[PDB]
Symmetry: C2
Subunit: 124 residues, 2 copies
């Protein structure tokens, strides 16, 4: 079993690139980050900033999570991100994703000590 | 009781303005659209495009909804939107919102005949 923090890193962190490299970025990443194993995870966002910058969001703008929880934080700045979403031709175990690059604020839920991201809520 | 389509329009459509007009936009809109009545709705997005343009998204890019449903659609173009999110000083019945303006693709779930938006899933 993964810690909540490590699962966030696996699902959402890609500091190795400044932005999605091709239209196939999501197909490759959803697979290598183990998000197509038991099923096709329908929607998932990768952040192309350092881990330190993403962790720093937990000390930024406190905002409500979509579900009403009070431990969500919005980044003061925009960040390079990629939205991966299953498309019509996607059928487990043959998972297919649309790659959409963008620059926006991210909203994450934070927990623990050290207080670090444990869920990606949204981007704005 | 509202139809699903009318509830979408009430919660998410603002074609009267090209973008949020002030930092108080969300406080005003969340109230007048009746989203602070029984509780503070934690998160809500308004779209500043014509209703025809938003309805047209149901014939655009078919993508998975965050919950796995297959009836979600992503707009081919970006749209002017405003993200409203409760902030720390928010306590029902005194609801307080942060206003964040942006330009991005919207993702909506569509249902019915006419096939129209019934849920705002996300923006990218």
């Amino acid at each position: 079993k993964e810690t909540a923090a490590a699962k966030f890193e696996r699902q959402h962190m890609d500091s190795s690139t400044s932005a999605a490299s091709s239209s196939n970025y999501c197909n490759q990443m959803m697979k290598s980050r183990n998000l197509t194993k038991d099923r096709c995870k329908p929607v998932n966002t990768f952040v192309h900033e350092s881990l330190a910058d993403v962790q720093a969001v937990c000390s930024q703008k406190n905002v409500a999570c979509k579900n009403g929880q009070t431990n969500c934080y919005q980044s003061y700045s925009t960040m390079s991100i990629t939205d991966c979403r299953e498309t019509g031709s996607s059928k487990y175990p043959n998972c297919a994703y649309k790659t959409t690059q963008a620059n926006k604020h991210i909203i994450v839920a934070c927990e623990g000590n050290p207080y670090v991201p444990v869920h990606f809520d949204a981007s704005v």
